[PDB]
Amino acid sequence: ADRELDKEGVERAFSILEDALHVPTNPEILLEKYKNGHRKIPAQTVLFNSLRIWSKYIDYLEAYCPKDANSSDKIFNKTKMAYNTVIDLRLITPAMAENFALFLQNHYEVMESFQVYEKTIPLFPPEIQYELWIEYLEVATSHQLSSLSPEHIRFLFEKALKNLCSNGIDCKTIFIAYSVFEERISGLISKSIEILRRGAVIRLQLWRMCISKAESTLGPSVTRELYQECIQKAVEFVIKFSDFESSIGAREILAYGAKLLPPSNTELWDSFEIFELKHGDKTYKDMLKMKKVLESNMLIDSASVS
Amino acid sequence: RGGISYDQLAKLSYEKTLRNLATQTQNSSKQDKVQKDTKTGKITIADDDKLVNKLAVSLQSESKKRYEARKRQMQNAKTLYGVESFINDKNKQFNEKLSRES
Amino acid sequence: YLIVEESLNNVEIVRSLYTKWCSLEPGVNAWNSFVDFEIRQKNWNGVREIYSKYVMAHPQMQTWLKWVRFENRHGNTEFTRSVYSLAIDTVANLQNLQIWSDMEVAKLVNSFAHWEAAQQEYERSSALYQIAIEKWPSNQLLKAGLLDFEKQFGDINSIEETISYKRKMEYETILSNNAYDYDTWWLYLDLISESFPKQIMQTFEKAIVDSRKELSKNVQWKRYIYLWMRYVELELENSLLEEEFQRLIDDIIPHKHFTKIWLMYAKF
Structure with missing residues (x-):
């Protein structure tokens, strides 16, 4: 192929490489009879299976198609059937599945590139679907030609988000993409229960903390519910987050310092928390010294237990 | 996990000998009726004496191979463990049997 | 009995043995080794006769879908849709017996449709979803498996038509479960005002x-x-504003008939 591409046209380079890729009647039987055949059956018959053959065939097509193809052209109809044949042969790698969906979005075939993500995710195992769902959900919300309804974009998240956390992946971004887009198209703070689910799946502390900042902008009635639910090493970090929420909107915070120190070992960071709560006031270094006195006595009790 | 039932074990044993009979025909191919006597009622089948000999040889080879794969397991398991107190070999095989329980 | 007569290359004795053994209805291990026997012998017409009997001995989709995995392995299009037509009629013919579950019939409708999508006939892929949902309005899995077919092979207005229904049922079942989640109301109404406009709206x-x-x-x-x-609008406005208003009624009388309805709603 490579010597003929320089000497002769790419149409000559296709035609010598078209003869490689005849998918005859049945690839399932020929693939199996080749694998079970002990070196007697030639690989001339099962030559279509080879990924290397398809990728450099396609890369000639995707290079030869013009920058404006718009589906009238023969070649854009030719590279799409050659791309779809790879998916039907099922020998498509996930970087190659992105190269076809990217291929359609440059040539304004955006609404058919959502079919491209749709066909392939089923075929792949998770830990790889997470990289396709980023590129699929981002085209749905960011690309300008995609006019999808806000109940259709919400379908694409909560079909993925439910499916993808079911097999078990951290899913930090998809939660945020379903969190960020909710203001740009809908514009209400339903964001919290959409993002609470990140904190309570069945990193996670870094999803819980940024949003409990966000409802202190909107309204304190839905902050204080999170401050309760935030606390129910990692446990100690959750207690610290609760103390910060109390400072934003003090006795509940000090008692929380007790609840957190009693949550777990070391507790000096909690001392920094109560000290922060004391420092926040613009009252008497009496309750503070009493607090350090109570903490020290608790430490002495822990030493007695040990 | 868990164990395999006898109807699932018998099929896998039947699937395995079909692959031994497949490669036996492939190793052979690489190198190169019914009569019912009406008076007695007996049915006589005429078959190749080579395939009956290859049936009798392969059963003896599988019988010896499992005999040798178990004999080495007897010689290895006797010379693995000697920590816990024993008296004879039947005590060792019983105290090892208590270990597979827990 | 089999692997000895296999070893003697007596192919007519294992065939006579298997015909008897599959007559006593033993289980799926026997039949699956009997369809694997004819693949060895290349008897393609004989193994097709077995699956005719195998679906009658074990009526369940993993025996019917095994027979379409047989036919789509060989690529014979005339034989595969004949099996597909027999599989979906028998679910309809024997609906009252209640031996295929809702998740079980969804595997037949989807594997029928995704095969018809690969056979480039999208109008047969599309129409069978309507007959299955009508033929079975009970199973949600066949309705939900209808949607994923439109997502892959349908044109965009058809997906949005079907998407609007699944969102309708899912917003309805949360609000019946959860009492006062006011943020799902402000989308469920806007689900119906956007795409459902009608008496329901x-x-x-x-x-x-x-x-x-x-x-x-x-x-x-x-x-x-x-x-x-x-x-209308005033009448419902007075009914809700009754929650309590002596200053409101004095505010109402001065600027209801004098100025508008928008002024009337300003009091509320």
Whole structure:
């Protein structure tokens, strides 16, 4: 192929490489009879299976198609059937599945590139679907030609988000993409229960903390519910987050310092928390010294237990 | 996990000998009726004496191979463990049997 | 008995043995080794006779879908849709016996449709979803498996038509479960105002303002108000404003007939 591409046209380079890729009647039987055949059956018959053959065939097509193809052209109809044949042969790698969906979005075939993500995710195992769902959900919300309804974009998240956390992946971004887009198209703070689910799946502390900042902008009635639910090493970090929420909107915070120190070992960071709560006031270094006195006595009790 | 039932074990044993009979025909191919006597009622089948000999040889080879794969397991398991107190070999095989329980 | 007569290359004795053994209805291990026997012998017409009997001995989709995995392995298109036509009629013919579950019939409808999508006939892929949902309105899995077919092979207005229904059922089942989640109301109404406009569109707005006391609640009524107002309006406005208003009635009398309805709603 490579010597003929320089000497002769790419149409000559296709035609010598078209003869490689005849998918005859049945690839399932020929693939199996080749694998079970002990070196007697030639690989001339099962030559279509080879990924290397398809990728450099396609890369000639995707290079030869013009920058404006718009589906009238023969070649854009030719590279799409050659791309779809790879998916039907099922020998498509996930970087190659992105190269076809990217291929359609440059040539304004955006609404058919959502079919491209749709066909392939089923075929792949998770830990790889997470990289396709980023590129699929981002085209749905960011690309300008995609006019999808806000109940259709919400379908694409909560079909993925439910499916993808079911097999078990951290899913930090998809939660945020379903969190960020909710203001740009809908514009209400339903964001919290959409993002609470990140904190309570069945990193996670870094999803819980940024949003409990966000409802202190909107309204304190839905902050204080999170401050309760935030606390129910990692446990100690959750207690610290609760103390910060109390400072934003003090006795509940000090008692929380007790609840957190009693949550777990070391507790000096909690001392920094109560000290922060004391420092926040613009009252008497009496309750503070009493607090350090109570903490020290608790430490002495822990030493007695040990 | 868990164990395999006898109807699932018998099929896998039947699937395995079909692959031994497949490669036996492939190793052979690489190198190169019914009569019912009406008076007695007996049915006589005429078959190749080579395939009956290859049936009798392969059963003896599988019988010896499992005999040798178990004999080495007897010689290895006797010379693995000697920590816990024993008296004879039947005590060792019983105290090892208590270990597979827990 | 089999692997000895296999070893003697007596192919007519294992065939006579298997015909007897599959007559006593033993289980799926026997039949699957009997369809694997004829693949060895290349008897393609004989193994097709077995699956005719194998679906009658074990009526279940993993025996029917095994027979379509046989036919799609060989690529014979005339034989595969004949099996597909026999599989979906027998579910319809034997509906009252109740031996295939809702998740079980969804595997047959989807594997019929995704095969017809690969056979480039999208109008047969599309129409069978309608007959299956009507033929079975009970199973949600066949309705939900209808949607994923449109996502892959359908044109965009058809997906949005079907998407609007699944969102309708899922918003309906949360609000029946969860009592006062006011943020799902403000989308469920806007689900029906956007894509469902009809008698239902007015009706839910009644059914919402039924559910409407919080600060979190009452602004939903404000939405239903203008939703009514954009399109009576005074009559429902007085009924809701009755929550309590002596200053309001004195404010009402001075600027109801004097100035508008928008002035009337300003009091509320």
